[PDB]
Amino acid sequence: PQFSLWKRPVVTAYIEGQPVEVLLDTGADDSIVAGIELGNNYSPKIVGGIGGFINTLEYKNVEIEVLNKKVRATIMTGDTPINIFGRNILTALGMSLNL
Amino acid sequence: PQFSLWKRPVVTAYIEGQPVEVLLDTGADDSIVAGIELGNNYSPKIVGGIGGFINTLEYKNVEIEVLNKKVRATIMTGDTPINIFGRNILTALGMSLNL
């Protein structure tokens, strides 16, 4: 709807029928997610952070259902402290930054 | 304005005169920068993300000029790769993250 940038902008999601509570990170290229089992159709990936680089696993065209829409998009699985959805899922949802 | 997230929401802001091309990040709490001589009046903070932790030198009451908006803020200094604008100054400019 709108999100005031006062409280962190977390949302509960379903990353292929599996419930995960997520952050809307607009400083994120991607979306990450620890604690899920996507398949075996991954790709060894590296993503950098604010304190450095990690390795994720990259599963294409994952069903995802958040905010009352369905999206199939590209989820990485690595050790993210918080599960983040990036500019990649924000534009599927059809969010922006309104000033 | 408006920001769509097919491109990362980068723009130029002013930290007492010094422009730094920044990223508007709903995933940051606080606004972290690199390559800014602010003061010798700071408190060394530490913040973590993806890849862990960096140490910052948090500075308080710090005027910023971004997107034709003029504000005073808290931003840190540290070895952040890209200049990040956390929410702290996302709610000063008074942004929202809208569907």
Q: A interface mutation test: which of B2, B3, B5, B67 has the most A CBs within 10 A? A: B5
Which residues does B97 contact at the CB level (< 8 Å), separation at least 6?
A2, A3, A5, A9, A24, A26, A95, A96, A97, A98, B26
Q: Do A95 and B95 touch (CB under 8 A)?
A: no
B1 CB neighbours in chain A (<8 A) are 97-99
Domain boundaries, chain A: 1-99
Q: A1-99: which CATH topology?
A: Cathepsin D, subunit A; domain 1 (2.40.70)
Whose structure tokens read 């993300």? B49
DSSP secondary structure string, chain B?
---BTTS--EEEEEETTEEEEEEE-TT-SSEEESS----S----EEEEETTEEEEE--EEEEEEEETTEEEEEEEEES--SS-EE-GGGTTTTT-EEE-
Asked whether B85 and B22 are in contact (CB, 8 A), the reply is: yes
Closest approach of B45 to chain A, Cα-based (Å): 14
**Residue A31: half-sphere exposure toward Cβ, Cα within 13 Å:** 27
Q: Do A87 and B25 touch (CB under 8 A)?
A: no
Asked whether B65 and A66 are in contact (CB, 8 A), the reply is: no
At residue A31, the 3 state secondary structure works out as coil
Asked whether A60 and A74 are in contact (CB, 8 A), the reply is: yes
- Choose among A8, A67, A29: nearest CA to B81: A29
